């Protein structure tokens, strides 16, 4: 409970840092307290369904599926950061399933789309996902916290690929 609190505090500091500067890059040294924790995934990923993201896409050699996952995660990170930009992109309100970059990266994994819903892309058109007309701007806290979790998971997978994750054997539990 105490370790869990320290984690949440660390999570909030990083999410706030993303709200001030959406282009802010985090070093592995910065992410260390979020990486070194022995807390379960459910207590560390509050918005992202990390276990389902990993487990439902673990098909074949890790060296391939972890790489595919990273690729989806890196693009999902860019979607989040763009929503935090002091100047939001024109057409931030919707993402098309048939976007070349979206199809080849995010739609390559199971649950890729659900992550856009966490950002606020809750409305479903057969062409893609949109914000509701009633939402005029993105909830910045929700967005920052999802973006951070997306970046954290990508960071975790990257160390697994390199075999340098602090809890590497305990994470191959799956």
């Amino acid at each position: 409970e105490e370790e869990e609190r320290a984690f949440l505090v660390a999570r909030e500091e990083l999410a706030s840092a993303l709200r001030r500067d959406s282009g802010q890059a985090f070093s592995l040294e910065q992410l260390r307290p979020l990486l070194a924790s022995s807390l379960p995934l459910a207590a560390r990923y509050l918005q992202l369904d990390a276990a389902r993201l990993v487990r439902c896409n673990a098909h074949g050699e890790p060296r391939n599926y972890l790489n595919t996952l990273s690729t989806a995660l890196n693009i999902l990170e860019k979607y989040g950061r763009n929503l935090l930009s002091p100047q939001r992109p024109r057409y931030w309100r919707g993402v098309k399933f048939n976007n070349p970059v979206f199809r080849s990266t995010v739609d390559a994994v199971q649950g890729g789309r659900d992550v856009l819903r966490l950002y606020g892309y809750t409305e479903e058109q057969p062409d893609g996902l949109s914000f509701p007309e009633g939402q005029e701007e993105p909830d910045e806290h929700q967005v920052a916290t999802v973006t951070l979790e997306v970046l954290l998971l990508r960071t975790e997978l990257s160390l697994l690929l390199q075999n340098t994750h602090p809890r590497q054997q305990a994470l191959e539990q799956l």
């Binding site: 979607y79 992109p89 024109r90 057409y91 931030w92 919707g94 976007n99 970059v101 979206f102």
Partner: peptide, 4 residues
Amino acid sequence: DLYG
């Protein structure tokens, strides 16, 4: 681009 991500929104096309």
